[model samples]
Target chain A: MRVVIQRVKGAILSVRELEIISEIKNGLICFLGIHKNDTWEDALYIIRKCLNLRLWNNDNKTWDKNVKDLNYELLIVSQFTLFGNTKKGNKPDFHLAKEPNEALIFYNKIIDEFKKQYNDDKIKIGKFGNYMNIDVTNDGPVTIYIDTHDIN
Target chain B: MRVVIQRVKGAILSVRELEIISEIKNGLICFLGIHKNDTWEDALYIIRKCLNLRLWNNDNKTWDKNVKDLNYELLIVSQFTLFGNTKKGNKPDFHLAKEPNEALIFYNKIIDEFKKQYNDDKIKIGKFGNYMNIDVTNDGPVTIYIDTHDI
Candidate 1:
């Protein structure tokens, strides 16, 4: 599993005539990409970081708060293109990303696990593998990229 | 040079009481990172891909239109943290990123080149190395990452 987590002031997910599908006020918007060989342990490691990383600065000090600490929320969007490999040419090839059929179920399981670790209210998600227009107000623009494979 | 480019329906950038600085509709948002050893050639490779990549689906087909083909705009944001190394710990250390003073000038030159390749009006950027809230409408949710070093 791989994820690019950006701290957000807010986010609104919409589709089909721009109807709002889901939204959050203050949180982290995780662009999650699943690998073909990702395991349950891989899922767990990503979950732990999204929940615990202190991307936000405290009122008294800097870099001292996670999503849970401030009762913030999370919007996890499945983005297969994070695995896009463009080493050779201008066009990207998505061979490294998990296939859609297998990835959807795996992604769903990870979302369920995310809610299980945090509250359902604290977690939001876009549709599995679809064209979505997310209006995200990025705060600090603090970008955090994590590859579960990078860890043991 | 490293960049994560996402297709966007629209975007608005703001800072300091949320004042709007620059905005664009229907384009790409590039989160750009400058490496300590990045060369002008590295910047060219990234710029070429950003301008020429066929990321949008045409009315007749899929992945048939580039940003310039559709006459769309681009919002480039300087993101040093893309070089953040987290292999050893939870907190990312951005030692691999070029220092801000050097990066700002390098980044500025790169932006001018982008305008040179495309029209000047087609490009927009946020304040270098500062806090800004960018409200971006992501389309297709298409994500594209490029590492010039990888090439």
Candidate 2:
């Protein structure tokens, strides 16, 4: 499993104009990808880091508040191309992504766990494997990457 | 907007075990990403190519049938990372992404257009800007990419 985390400003918008639907103000948008060999622990590791990583400046301090600490939001998006192979051709070979069928089942479990570990309202998600126009307000433009296989 | 098109075999699984759900035997999986300045023309360009590009071999010849010709399926996924920049540091800078709020509306319109040009049944979609468990079985594993901004 792997994840790319970005610090965002103000709100995470799904239905941007609507005063309703899922919206999160101030937080991170985590682009997550599952490997063929990724396990539940890998998912947990990404989730915990997403929740605990202190990307925000607390008061006068830099890098102080984590997403959970500031009661901010987290948007998790499925990204399989993280494992793309660009060896020879301009085209990438996604030989490492988990099969879409089983990956979905595992992805659902990960989402459920995210809610379980954090406030359900605080956790938002991208439509699993669907088309989207997600506008992430990149604050600090701070980006973090994690590949569980690195530890393995 | 940008897209990475993949030739796929078997079914695209959401709830794979369910006896019934949106499933396709053969077609393309289009990973779509919206640029900060993508116009509707960009969306249509992608749609036309995805539908008309004859990627399948016809009768003994290679590259014969289009998605519509064979009535194949297309799964469109929102992919902003298509614009991710990894220049200076390994951390990708998505400086080209349009804000998520308005992008959502734009994405919906593109989906509608895709259905308009192709059979709605043949055009499936992933959740817009949400977490997804998409299982795609790569057929040729032939991936094609297009950046509408290029034109």
Candidate 3:
């Protein structure tokens, strides 16, 4: 599993020519990717790491708060392309990414865990296998990348 | 300089509740990142690479076409955060990314080059400094990342 975390002042998820799924005023917009070998434990680990990431600041160059500490919202998007491999040519091979059916199951599990920590309104989600437009206003222009294999 | 290329059946670029910049139906969506040390040459290199990327297929397991070969439209978005560094803490350091003013200049240069190669209508752009929502239907789920440093 791999996740790209961006600290945002505001973010919105909208479908192509369709309705907006959800929007958050202040939070982190996470692009999550599931691998073929990723397990439920991998999903849980990434979620906890994302939830506990101390990314915000209140004082002089000192780390202070995580999303939970600030009561911030979280917008999660499913992106299987994170596992794309381009060593062969300009064309990327996504065979390493999880299939949609199995990937969605674990993706939802992360969301369910987020709901447990924050209210439903505090957690926004992008559609699993649809075209999504993610409007991201990255606060402090902060972005972080986390991979389950790198944890522990 | 890092570029993420996605071959798309359709794509759209929109600001946060403001307006839609451009949308294309059969094309490519590219997220471009500029590093502080990057130059016009880097911009030109990436532009040519993206335009010439061979990604589409007309046969079974045999890839044989590039974007220009199919005259596909292109969508480009500026994403400086691509250079974010997280070696220190959860808070990523973006000192490696180019400042907005300079980055926009190079980004526009890529657009101008694209116009020179293809028709004006064939290239769409995302707002340089605004937050953008990119609607991408990646054909074949084909996505590629390129860095000028590696080239």
TM-score of each: 0.95, 0.50, 0.63
Model 1 misses residue A90 by how many Å? 3.4
Best by TM-score: 1
A3-112 per-residue lDDT for model 1 (tens digits): 88888989999877678889999889999999989999999888898888877787896767889988999999999989887666656678989999999999999999
Model 3: per-residue Cα lDDT over B19-45, one tens digit each: 666788887877778899998888877
DockQ of model 2 vs. true complex: 0.03
Per residue, candidate 3 scores C-alpha lDDT tens digits across A1-152 of 87777677787666765567778877787778889998878787777767877777877854468888888999888888777665456656689999999888878888998888667777888778986655555454445656677544
lDDT of 2 by residue, A51-140 (tens): 877667767876677888888988777777666544334334577789899888998899899899888888887666654444443453
Root-mean-square deviation (CA) per prediction? 1.6, 13.4, 5.6
lDDT of 2 by residue, B2-94 (tens): 766667664333432232344556888776778889888888888887787767778896655778888888877777665654233323345
Share of reference contacts found in each model: 0.69, 0.00, 0.15
TM-score of chain B of each: 0.97, 0.89, 0.91
- What Cα-based lDDT does every candidate model obtain? 0.87, 0.68, 0.73
- Higher-lDDT candidate among 2 and 3? 3
Question: Candidate 2: lDDT of A44?
Answer: 83
> What's the TM-score, to 2 decimals, of chain B in model 2?
0.89
Q: Which sequence of candidate numbers ranks them by TM-score, best first? A: 1, 3, 2
lDDT of 2 at A111: 86
Ranking by lDDT: 1, 3, 2
